[PDB]
Amino acid sequence: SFPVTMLPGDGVGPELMHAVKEVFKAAAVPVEFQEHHLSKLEQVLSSMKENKVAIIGKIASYDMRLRRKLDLFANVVHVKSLPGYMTRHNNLDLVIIREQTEGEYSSLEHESARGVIECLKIVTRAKSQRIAKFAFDYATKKGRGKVTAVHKANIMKLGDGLFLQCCEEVAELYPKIKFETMIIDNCCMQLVQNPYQFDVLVMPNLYGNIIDNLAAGLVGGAGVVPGESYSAEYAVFETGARHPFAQAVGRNIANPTAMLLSASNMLRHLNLEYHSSMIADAVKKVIKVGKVRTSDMGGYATCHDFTEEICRRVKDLDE
Amino acid sequence: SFPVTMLPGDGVGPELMHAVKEVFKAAAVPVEFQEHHLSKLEQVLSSMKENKVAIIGKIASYDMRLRRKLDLFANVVHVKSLPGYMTRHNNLDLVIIREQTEGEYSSLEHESARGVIECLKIVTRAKSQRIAKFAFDYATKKGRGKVTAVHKANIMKLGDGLFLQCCEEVAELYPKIKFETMIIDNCCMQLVQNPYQFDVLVMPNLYGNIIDNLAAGLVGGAGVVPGESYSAEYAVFETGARHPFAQAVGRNIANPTAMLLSASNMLRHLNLEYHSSMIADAVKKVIKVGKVRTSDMGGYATCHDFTEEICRRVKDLDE
Amino acid sequence: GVQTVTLIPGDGIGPEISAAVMKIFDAAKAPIQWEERNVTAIQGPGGKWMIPSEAKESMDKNKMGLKGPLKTPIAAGHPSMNLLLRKTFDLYANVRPCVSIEGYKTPYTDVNIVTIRENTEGEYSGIEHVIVDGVVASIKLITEGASKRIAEFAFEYARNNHRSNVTAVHKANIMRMSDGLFLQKCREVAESCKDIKFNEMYLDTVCLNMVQDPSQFDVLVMPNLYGDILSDLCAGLIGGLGVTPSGNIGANGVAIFESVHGTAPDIAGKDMANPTALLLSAVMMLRHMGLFDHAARIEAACFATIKDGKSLTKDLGGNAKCSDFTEEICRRVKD
Amino acid sequence: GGVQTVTLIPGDGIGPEISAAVMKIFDAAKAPIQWEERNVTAIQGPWMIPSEAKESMDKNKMGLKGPLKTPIAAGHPSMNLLLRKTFDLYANVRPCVSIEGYKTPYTDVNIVTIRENTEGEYSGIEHVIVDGVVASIKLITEGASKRIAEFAFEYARNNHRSNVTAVHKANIMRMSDGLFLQKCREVAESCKDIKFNEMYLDTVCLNMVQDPSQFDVLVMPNLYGDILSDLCAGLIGGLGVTPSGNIGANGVAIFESVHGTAPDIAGKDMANPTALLLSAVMMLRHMGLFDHAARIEAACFATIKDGKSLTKDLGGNAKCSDFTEEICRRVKD
């Protein structure tokens, strides 16, 4: 088989993971999940050293502690319409590429005086170059034709200027990819107005968070949008919109479309291409036919109702 | 042969470089000064890229910018009693080694709020591991036995402990050298009671500023203690205590001893050992016989007179 | 009696649309006198740029300003126009009310959102340090006085414009100390304004919800960077910056109401500019002055002029000119 | 007029012997002092100093503190930090004077180092920017600086001191040290009966070693005072003979001995009370008991110039009791 470390996490996490494995069982997916029951920590890294691939729920910070030990510097969110699920921006196809290790996210805060707080935002040449080349490496491997660098360099002239600088440099080594630059607040206005003008977007940490959840809203929300985070060695597959109330639903309510699609994108990375496409097609058909929809997509169906429908339709493609 | 870059500097600088030239002339030294009347002027990197050595006077701000363009990271100050000059601490032989590109010296200051100033002190592994290897390489090349790391790591646990951490690791690569640590304020108090317990001292920028001048006072003052700054590629020879009013008052009253001594130290670096020891011991003997002394040494002679005497005995064949 | 407002027509289409507001304001019998001023920075002592004195003196006297788009300065040492004004007048609150326009179709129809952005600190502190080569630290600055001040205005805004709820938007989960203090000062003011409903949400949650359903939101208040963004997002929901009013409230009763769109230099001179943005900003100003009845008429008589759609400008998906659009509004503000 | 209770913190090692010695010298001098022993050794709360010790300092505003113990836990914070944050100790004060009994290469030293004790480089704020890159935050504020300079000129007036030097590094740290210089100037132009000057740290260190005659009262930010004070201590003999007081808010003030706990000679009668005693002298002058202070001081100095009875650390074989009771004899003049 294929060993993959599974961090179920909290909330619907353990339930969404139960969906991945009921759908993997139904599809005879040659994958053995090695389940790290709770979120000391280094056993996940030693397991990641041999397995190299993980699939996680949700859980500096605890989850951005994990991302440092595994060097998950690059986050990728595929923002793609699902044909059956109608929103205000259908037939849209963007990828968000977010840097995940620098910025505000390292709790470099202090009190310089009573009632005066400083938060440091860190931008280095090292990680800007690494995420800029990643973005162009992404655009060529996957055959996208444009990389837009989002920033606020007209106000933070250093720092955000240094991100833009790197981005513009790497942009020169990739002549067949088009390279534009856009200011963060203008870009957010364009996403609600004409999201179709973008292809790949590369940005730093906080803008990523903003655009991640913004664009996931375009295409149906936190229930359907997959993400993945890379290092140089490791690939870890999660959901795309990672805000705090992403799927704060009770038992048997949540939509497993996000995790399942990202599960199928893991299978591709494992080179199990037949299975990756079988599970992707099932999900997309079940959604398009419209018989079974979770509450977040309109329908009245539970999460079990929905994923066992996936199971039926995918044991059939294995006719 | 041998071109050497000269930057006379401000203050009494030019009159000391005048003294250097006259003693070199007296000694018939094969060293031609290509001098620059500074104070972009990348001209000096242009010149040092060929000459590789300089003799400089008193000069982020210009000095710290120059050191940055020449990567003059390591500073070496020689604290040695001169046999004729009697102080409260005689027969002392210390070497002060100081990091010079970091700490509080890059003008990283801002206002958090009206009446609240922040000032960042920068310590990095890279430059602490480098100044640490240099101090131990200095002890090996020069037959020294002990390297003492001076810090305030009990208050600034990160940062001075980083500097400490890098020293301790480098110290393991030099088992033949003994290694001690001491806390900056203790060290100062020890330097007045019993500086003899020290061999070689290594420290970051600001404590280097403090101990450079403090130790200079033990053995004579700012007019007799010479110093040098090194790169990987460059050697610049200056005076040891370069505090703001070092010799800044007067004209034809300055002491040329400090400059002359590091002038001879410079000749030693160019492998002109014959002229280096000739000049050195001329100066040491004029000071010991005690005929002419400048005012900082309890005498009543001018800079010209004192230098006329050094010249007179460089040329005196019955030494 | 009749009040004097300092008029800053700006550059490019600015004059044309400022002229258009002056004529619309005249048809409304609105008690408004205009005092033209020019804010283009001059080089003061030592070369330190500044707002002209007649510009400052006239704002400090009349308190209210109406200001059109301004050209981007070309000199490199020249500071931001927005920054100069903000510092000259202590403009601490930026206000952007976004309301779906009945006749201008976008994917969103039920939008009515007022973003109140803190305008003086946060990540726009202007403090950056090159720590080492290749490593930069940008200082985000949050203070209790500024966060308290902005929260007091959001509640002031909601009280004076009959607004139901106020939401503090933040990332206290990521920036616990700074955003927490902002969220704390919001909470404290929130307890002295129990007649306005108050709640908290995360910025990332607010953006994903903002685009699925904007009706769920009302008055929003957040730190600087979050407002600069959310306000443009929200403006993207109603048709862009050309239909979007802006206010900047400051010290000593000073408020400047502006258009956030650009100079449009290619269509200057032509009768092609659209004044809706500046005009709607002028009715923001009216309501700020307490001329609610006059504002309600000019507002309602421009919404009408767009609803029937007989003569929109080039940008609004129409073929008419600046004269006709203006003239329709004048006609209807008379009945 | 009236008896005062002073919190006594005898401390560890030679602590309780030398504070017991001071107690009895104070007794022999009929000084208006009662004592109230307490223990500042910190304890794990919900680390903190015990509340009975806090209530005693709150009531009796004066403490006399012997040498404390270096805690062993790494998570244990500086015992000086707890005491400083508890009572807001903002001025650390070290009067260094040449003892004429005790020969040193420096014979005419009389310097007072008033050190700012709340901010500076010792702000306790540091960040790891990235791997192997640390930033330490030095804080200089307007209020702290004014407060320290206002003490310094007060100390100079009350202790009949002629000059006050602000020592700084404002050519390097032009904003932070600049503000400190800016407020010392403001206070100076309000106390124009004191000749006020400024000098660079590195100039002062160079001159101190060469001629301490030229200095008087030095006011300076935290780290500079931490270093400059130990440096001047070495001018006169070391931590074993230097007083020290930390002035705080709410009338609080803790005079301490800065030497170590000397556990090898604990129990034996070999400790030197000179340092803890000359701080007790400081406490009296701070309290206003100038006549009891000069008396006890003159007793101690005379006992050292005679040399008949010196402890092991000043060059004698006298026991600690032989040394103290001789002092007790003299102060009954």
Author numbering:
A (entry chain D), B (entry chain C): 14 to 52, 62 to 81, 92 to 351
C (entry chain A): 3 to 337
D (entry chain B): 2 to 47, 51 to 337
Sentences from the paper on this structure:
Crystals of the apo αMβ belong to space group C21, and the asymmetry unit contains eight αMβ heterodimers, which form four (αMβ)2 heterotetramers through noncrystallographic 2-fold axes. In the apo αMβ structure, the conformations of the β3B-α3B and β12B-α8B loops are similar to those in the WT αβ heterodimer. In the αβ, αMβ, and αMMgβADP structures, the active site assumes an “open” conformation due to the absence of substrate and/or cofactor. However, in all of the αMβ structures, the hydrogen-bonding network at the αβ-αβ interface is similar to that in the αMgγMg+CIT structure or the αMγ structures, indicative of active conformations. In the αMβ structures, the α-Q139A mutation eliminates the Gln139A1-Gln139A2 hydrogen bond. The intramolecular hydrogen bonds His131A1-Gln139A1 and His131A2-Gln139A2 are replaced by the intermolecular hydrogen bonds His131A1-His142B2 and His131A2-His142B1, and in addition, His142B1 and His142B2 form extra hydrogen bonds with Glu150B1 and Glu150B2. The changes of hydrogen-bonding interactions at the αβ-αβ interface induce conformational changes of the β5-β6 loops, which lead the sidechains of Tyr126A and Tyr137B to adopt the active conformations as well. The results show that in the absence of activators, both αMβ and αMγ heterodimers exhibit significantly higher Vmax and lower S0.5,ICT compared to those of the WT αβ and αγ heterodimers. In contrast to the WT αβ and αγ heterodimers, both of which exist as heterodimers (75 kDa) at low concentration and a dimer of heterodimers or heterotetramer [(αβ)2 and (αγ)2] (130 kDa) at high concentration, the mutant heterodimers exhibit an average molecular mass of approximately 131 to 149 kDa at both low and high concentrations, corresponding to a heterotetramer [(αMβ)2 and (αMγ)2].
Human NAD-dependent isocitrate dehydrogenase or IDH3 (HsIDH3) catalyzes the decarboxylation of isocitrate into α-ketoglutarate in the tricarboxylic acid cycle. It consists of three types of subunits (α, β, and γ) and exists and functions as the (αβαγ)2 heterooctamer. HsIDH3 is regulated allosterically and/or competitively by numerous metabolites including CIT, ADP, ATP, and NADH. In this work, we report the crystal structures of the αβ and αγ heterodimers and the (αβαγ)2 heterooctamer containing an α-Q139A mutation in the clasp domain, which renders all the heterodimers and the heterooctamer constitutively active in the absence of activators.
